[PDB]
Amino acid sequence: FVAGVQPYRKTYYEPGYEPKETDLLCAFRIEPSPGIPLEEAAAAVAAESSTGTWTEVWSQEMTDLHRYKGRCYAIDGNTAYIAYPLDLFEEGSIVNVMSSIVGNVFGFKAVRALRLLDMRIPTAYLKTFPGPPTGIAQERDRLKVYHRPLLGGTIKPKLGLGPKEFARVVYECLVGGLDTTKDDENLNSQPFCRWRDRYLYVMDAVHRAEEETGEAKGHWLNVTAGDTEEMLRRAEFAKEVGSRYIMVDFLTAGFSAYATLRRRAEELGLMIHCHRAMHAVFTRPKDHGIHFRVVAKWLRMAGGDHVHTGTVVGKLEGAREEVRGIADLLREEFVPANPQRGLLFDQPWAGLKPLFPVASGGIHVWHVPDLVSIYGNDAFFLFGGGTHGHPRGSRAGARANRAAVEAVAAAYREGRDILAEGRQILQDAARTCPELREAMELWEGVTF
Amino acid sequence: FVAGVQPYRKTYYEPGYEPKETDLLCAFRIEPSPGIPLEEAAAAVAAESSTGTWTEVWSQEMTDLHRYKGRCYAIDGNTAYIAYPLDLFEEGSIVNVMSSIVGNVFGFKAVRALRLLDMRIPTAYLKTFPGPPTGIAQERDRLKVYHRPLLGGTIKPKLGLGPKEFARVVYECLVGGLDTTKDDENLNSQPFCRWRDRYLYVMDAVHRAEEETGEAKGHWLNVTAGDTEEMLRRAEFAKEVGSRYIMVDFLTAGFSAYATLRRRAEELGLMIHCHRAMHAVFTRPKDHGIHFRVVAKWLRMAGGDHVHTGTVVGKLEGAREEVRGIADLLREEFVPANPQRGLLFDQPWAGLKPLFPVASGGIHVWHVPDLVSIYGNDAFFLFGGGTHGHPRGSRAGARANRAAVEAVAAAYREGRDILAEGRQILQDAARTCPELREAMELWEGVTF
Amino acid sequence: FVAGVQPYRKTYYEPGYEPKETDLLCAFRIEPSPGIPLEEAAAAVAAESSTGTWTEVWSQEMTDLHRYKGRCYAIDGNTAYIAYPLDLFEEGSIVNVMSSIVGNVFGFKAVRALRLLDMRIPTAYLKTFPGPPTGIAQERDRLKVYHRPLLGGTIKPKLGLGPKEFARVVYECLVGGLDTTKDDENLNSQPFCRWRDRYLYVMDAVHRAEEETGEAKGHWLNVTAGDTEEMLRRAEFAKEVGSRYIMVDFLTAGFSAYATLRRRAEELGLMIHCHRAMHAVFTRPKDHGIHFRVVAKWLRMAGGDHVHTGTVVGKLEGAREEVRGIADLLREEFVPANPQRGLLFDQPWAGLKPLFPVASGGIHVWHVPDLVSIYGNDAFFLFGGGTHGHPRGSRAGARANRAAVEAVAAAYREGRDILAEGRQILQDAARTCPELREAMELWEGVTF
Amino acid sequence: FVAGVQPYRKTYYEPGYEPKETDLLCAFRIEPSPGIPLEEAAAAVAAESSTGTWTEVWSQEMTDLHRYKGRCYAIDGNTAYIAYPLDLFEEGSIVNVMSSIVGNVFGFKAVRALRLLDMRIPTAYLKTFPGPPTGIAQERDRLKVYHRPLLGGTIKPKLGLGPKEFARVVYECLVGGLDTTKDDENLNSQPFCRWRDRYLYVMDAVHRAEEETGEAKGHWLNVTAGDTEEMLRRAEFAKEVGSRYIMVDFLTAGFSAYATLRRRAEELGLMIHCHRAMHAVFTRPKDHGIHFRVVAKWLRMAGGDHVHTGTVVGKLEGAREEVRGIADLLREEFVPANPQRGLLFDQPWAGLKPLFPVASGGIHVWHVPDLVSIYGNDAFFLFGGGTHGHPRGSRAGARANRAAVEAVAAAYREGRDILAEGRQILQDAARTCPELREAMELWEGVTF
Numbered sequence A, B, C, D: 001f002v003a004g005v006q007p008y009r010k011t012y013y014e015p016g017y018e019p020k021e022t023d024l025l026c027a028f029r030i031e032p033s034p035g036i037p038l039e040e041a042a043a044a045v046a047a048e049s050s051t052g053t054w055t056e057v058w059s060q061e062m063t064d065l066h067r068y069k070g071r072c073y074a075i076d077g078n079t080a081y082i083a084y085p086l087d088l089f090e091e092g093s094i095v096n097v098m099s100s101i102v103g104n105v106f107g108f109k110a111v112r113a114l115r116l117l118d119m120r121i122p123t124a125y126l127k128t129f130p131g132p133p134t135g136i137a138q139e140r141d142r143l144k145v146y147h148r149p150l151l152g153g154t155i156k157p158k159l160g161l162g163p164k165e166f167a168r169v170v171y172e173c174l175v176g177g178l179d180t181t182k183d184d185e186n187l188n189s190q191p192f193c194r195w196r197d198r199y200l201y202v203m204d205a206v207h208r209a210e211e212e213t214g215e216a217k218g219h220w221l222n223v224t225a226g227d228t229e230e231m232l233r234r235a236e237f238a239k240e241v242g243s244r245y246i247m248v249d250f251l252t253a254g255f256s257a258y259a260t261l262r263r264r265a266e267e268l269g270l271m272i273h274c275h276r277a278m279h280a281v282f283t284r285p286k287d288h289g290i291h292f293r294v295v296a297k298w299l300r301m302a303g304g305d306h307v308h309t310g311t312v313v314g315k316l317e318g319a320r321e322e323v324r325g326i327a328d329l330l331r332e333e334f335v336p337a338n339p340q341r342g343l344l345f346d347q348p349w350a351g352l353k354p355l356f357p358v359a360s361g362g363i364h365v366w367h368v369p370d371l372v373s374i375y376g377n378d379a380f381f382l383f384g385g386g387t388h389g390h391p392r393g394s395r396a397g398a399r400a401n402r403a404a405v406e407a408v409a410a411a412y413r414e415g416r417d418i419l420a421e422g423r424q425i426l427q428d429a430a431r432t433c434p435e436l437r438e439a440m441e442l443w444e445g446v447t448f
């Protein structure tokens, strides 16, 4: 054992290494600090994510470093590909994967910037995860909604509504045509609206809407809480009050608490909506953080029934091709690499169930064509402000959104170029839907 | 109710608003997108973090918006200060605070970049949190270590060591002079080292070291797991095998799972080490994300006994003044605003216990003076590679680090300018500590 | 440290002290013993309620006395105002507040008499309490009773009725027009009427009355018992038999047992009626004890849905202005100081839900105007003897009371001076309600 | 059934009634309001405590009123004796007894003032209660202290001491000669001293003192909390940390929570100290409230091992003869009526165990004779300020108090008139105890 500092690339840079089908592959966009070669930066990332530290240690003689070390096996431009042995990762733990890959390498002075673009989860590691508990087909059967994007909407204002008024808005939206509604990610339990009262009032509203309309309706009750036990108690109550849906902010709540909640919800027969609050703090920058496709893969492994993926045309940033790739990752059993969409690895899913992409944020009727072009039919379209911001109220807005979604889905099923004929399709739908006409007039030139 | 899109600043920009002592204040560095005024961007952040959406909603007539809305009450340069009413936040839930403040505002197209710099947690909201379960004084009493920084070290290599070899390294480090040791953040339970076997072997080593040295020793067993129940089971086993310490990756595991684990550990009498793995994905960029001082405040509220804060002179990025401010936040009962250190608010702590800052990452004996200058005595100095990378082994490295820390702490207590006389202090210590001399020679010019 | 007895005012009398918004303020009417100055008495009260004892102790050198001590910061007449630091009180514990403020200072020879008039609970301490689980609006929604005082009545005789006869009286009262009924505070479980049989028979009667009338009906089943576990079991059974209401004697049972019961009832979805039995042993005297406004604040913090507040015109002592102040404390989100009503502090409620004042005790139809003047619509009017003492039976008495309450509430909503036109309103109601006429004739000159 | 208001004395005043051995007898000092005869006031008290209301009710025809009604069977001066049938009271429930006897009769306008002086608990009702779990003899055997009053002391200052300093004071007191120590009634769990840390540190101190002195030592850890479950958890922890003692504020916490805690402590083998905080709010006034002898009877029924009874010569009000009567009630198996001591009934105890009277509050060495005269040997003498206020510290004060207690107990056992020779006995003890001499000099003229 030779004590002292040695370059990482001496051991953790293996350009000739051929990744094994069982290896976990990570793509890192690296901006090294001045004086640090890109190869050295990639080797440092691999070493400090898998086995290495800043200096040689005698203890390395007590284990097979070459069997366990992560190594950079390729560098294309600024993108370094690193392979990690399967044995490095705890089975069925997204937490361990994050602590390894994105644990400390992002804070190293040697790298000015570091972004995790894509991850290749091996089938062997995937088999250790449960996947979504319900799936797209089972959810559609539960809601009896087919050949159409599923409509929804966040109840607004985000905060300040009492349980009675909140449930009144929920009932208006559901009777107006929305398939589901949801609590806002920040609405968990507050003095103005405690979670028990909100659950009771909202489920009364949901049952009334189901009886009146005759269609399956639900509300994504937010069980997010400051402790896992409270989240489990809230999910149990949601099941008690008759809810078929719950929602959780898995990133803020955490992947461990989310795994516990997913197990409990599968036991309870509840569908889990996954809100990605706080993702943009590390998914937005193009030079640093984690691309949301990786988070989508992690969530699919952890077992979400729906997850937010982006609107592209909405108020929140999102790239069209990246969103298409994320939707394919969430919905397909095998996603081949697509450099245009940012997918740098062929990603099998080992039979893990698909989940619903959710489009939410500053989307109104005029955005329905584009959304259907991006997502097709197997997706959730959430209209919060587009529903309640209708001049005639939430019921009219829900009716307008339902009409627009149905018309665009019918055109898409017919093979029409919805991207080019979207305005005509919406106008034709509005000819018989005054609510749709009013919504189109109100938000004609509203763009982000 | 007037349907349509209105500027956020019309309602959510209130420059004349005077924050209440009960309000929660957030400072945001905002880089607005072209064509978006800074006032409009700040108002959008406040609205979409508290109550507002992209368009007016009739439901606003059902609640007092001005009582609940968050508003930007000041804009200095690119830093906008936003006040949130206390009633907006669920009691004792960091998850709700994150879902509100950093939920969706970071992904808005209107803002090119958004960074949460500082947060003013009101005393009323602080009283709803438990705080650290042990505290600095109680931990020192348990370890019987006073008037000296507490030594530690991550066992290396990060992965690949079996339980027997891992415990052998632990025993060598503890007998050499380290007060504690820890599992690496990515070492939870793997085929090469399962958590049960590691716990048993490591606690045997810790007990042997305690018997031989006669001083209190511990190992920060990592209970991080993919589910909260597994983490609780691992903490219970750690207590069963006689460990007085556990560690968890609270960010990757989550704040809800962390709160559950903290409650269970306080019940079990275990001290919790908090590893901030994955923080750099959103704390490093200067234009986007969350500054780690906010995360430190959140962790202190959630009840960590120690938390990593930075080395400044180590291998991971960290600013000296920011680290000093974070240490004051973690250790003081009241931290006045300090623009030099980035503290933009006076932060009371409502009697919440202080916790130990931890300095780890590419630090060896030569960095001990600076560290003591930055942190003083109430801190943990972690030497992973500095211990095992010693030429004569982990025991010699631990002895050298203990000697350096003791000498520098003695000089600091004597009022000497350790920053200027650090090399002389280390040389004088090495005159009687050959291990310290060897460590100094090996890493003389090693800088980051 | 100087051993020996020193005057309290030397340390615990700080006239220049400015109370902090986080401090807990107590107003004490003090009658000092001969030879004891009022300042000395107030200082003694503060010292022996917060930190001090009868003589100096060396241990005071081990803590910051000035940071933790309670101090008298003002003396107006015989009323001394004492400020206690927030850190002195355990979070979410009325028991600790009582043990501090009213623990031992009332038995001191130095003070001939001591009465706790008002307390200023800070918002920070309030946020640590749950508040009422249901609230006025939610309770009205559950009962579907709006714009009207809610009618009720204690079943009489207090004791000696079997479950069958008790339930028969309950059914007659509920079908006659009473919204709810209740067990007497002393009727818990006795050989003549065991609690299980009473619960079963009473819930059968309540369900029959609900079916016949078509209006929501309930009975405040008394779960008060000699142990907390028995109270929890009785509440669970009450939920099992379909009751939406339970009642407990929180003072006799205790605030700790009451807190446990409130948690369990919120879990069970039960509304809790709070009976203030044994309050008059320390709330009646004008020179000694605790004013009931303080107990009302404590109960609102502890989370009662309704609490008895007084009748003024009934058989039990009560001041009109004090009762108005107590009602405002129980029902308002912020109660400004009102010397006329005895409110010496501005009392925020930090979003804690309001609860229902209950007027009970020697009140018949003729007292309905005054009651509505005192309480308005958001209150419960309990007619025990006024219902069963009707010549034609409990059903006729309930009908008469309902008619009187409805007529007076309609007049009040119309802006009529119910205090001056109450007799005319009752006569006009009786023109179409023979039961009301009989009740008015029977109790025309019955006054207390 | 004749509807209308009738005088109470017509039915509830039965001067010729002969109380049955199974009846529960209450003595009430009554000050009737002007125009209300004393007989009418006593009848009203009986009626509204047992079965009656303000007017006749038809439901009385459904039960045997004369079998269940409470009746005033004698009026001597202003003291009315009322008999209540045994069947009126729930078995083993002090809460029900309080809700009946002292429920609402104290707030009646008909009575200007009402005080419950004494109660005759029948043997049949007593057999339904558990009594103290340990008893005087068992406690003495556990402590191995015989033929001597047991010494103790409240740790001062009441609040503001941390766990380490608190335990240091505890250790000094215990090693100095105190048999036990206790937390103050208001010290439960606070930011400055959390209950877990206090329990751990205090039990370490207690074990160290036991090892050093060789005598049994204990600390009355305060388990009082805002909920019964928290109190049970704290008692369980106290047992876990090795404590043989716990203390609870039974009045503030409540008799139901106290009964639950007593059951759990008997299961755990813990001795319960009963603090009577808040008693003086209703036991001090001579014209209104409840005399503490009744509360002492209730506590003995509920099963306390020790209870505070008064000092007479201390800082808190207390009558010598009343305190002697209370001590006899707590310690004797049968207490005959004693008008001089205020005992108006012969009180059997049906084999219920005796408990320890506790003398606390402004008592120093000079008060030891009087105390021994009042209580004898079977009592606890608590010196809070008398221990820590010693010039040389808590250890010296504890030594002085132990010396004084031992000397006075030896003189009492010898038949000496300790009341007349107390100063000589203390001086003779001080001839060989410099700490006692210093304590006597410091507090020579300190009187209350």
Ligand SMILES: O=C(O)[C@@](O)(COP(=O)(O)O)[C@H](O)[C@H](O)COP(=O)(O)O
Binding pocket: A154, A156, A184, A185, A275, A276, A277, A308, A309, A310, A311, A316, A359, A360, A361, A362, A363, A382, A383, A384, A385, A386, B048, B053, B054, B104, B107
């Ligand atoms: O808070 C909001 O902004 C929303 O309720 C949308 O409301 P509106 O429909 O009224 O705009 C959604 O949570 C987001 O759009 C963010 O989802 P994500 O970023 O995960 O796509």
Ligand SMILES: O=C(O)[C@@](O)(COP(=O)(O)O)[C@H](O)[C@H](O)COP(=O)(O)O
Binding pocket: A048, A053, A054, A104, A107, B154, B156, B184, B185, B275, B276, B277, B308, B309, B310, B311, B316, B359, B360, B361, B362, B363, B382, B383, B384, B385, B386
């Ligand atoms: O994995 C590592 O790099 C370490 O074990 C250090 O090992 P060495 O001492 O051998 O360098 C620590 O986890 C970090 O330094 C990160 O802590 P943080 O970023 O929270 O400060």
Ligand SMILES: O=C(O)[C@@](O)(COP(=O)(O)O)[C@H](O)[C@H](O)COP(=O)(O)O
Binding pocket: C154, C156, C184, C185, C275, C276, C277, C308, C309, C310, C311, C316, C359, C360, C361, C362, C363, C382, C383, C384, C385, C386, D048, D053, D054, D104, D107
């Ligand atoms: O026992 C009673 O006297 C009552 O049932 C009233 O019966 P009636 O309606 O037949 O008089 C009520 O408990 C009280 O009036 C006391 O309530 P509070 O003192 O809390 O106001």
Ligand SMILES: O=C(O)[C@@](O)(COP(=O)(O)O)[C@H](O)[C@H](O)COP(=O)(O)O
Binding pocket: C048, C053, C054, C104, C107, D154, D156, D184, D185, D275, D276, D277, D308, D309, D310, D311, D316, D359, D360, D361, D362, D363, D382, D383, D384, D385, D386
């Ligand atoms: O707080 C106090 O005053 C004490 O700790 C005494 O301290 P000192 O010995 O230092 O005076 C005791 O609780 C009381 O005397 C009241 O007991 P009670 O009224 O039940 O007799």
Ligand SMILES: [Mg+2]
Binding pocket: A154, A183, A184, A185, A186
């Ligand atoms: Mg949302």
Ligand SMILES: [Mg+2]
Binding pocket: B154, B183, B184, B185, B186
């Ligand atoms: Mg590490």
Ligand SMILES: [Mg+2]
Binding pocket: C154, C183, C184, C185, C186
């Ligand atoms: Mg009653």
Ligand SMILES: [Mg+2]
Binding pocket: D154, D183, D184, D185, D186
């Ligand atoms: Mg005390």
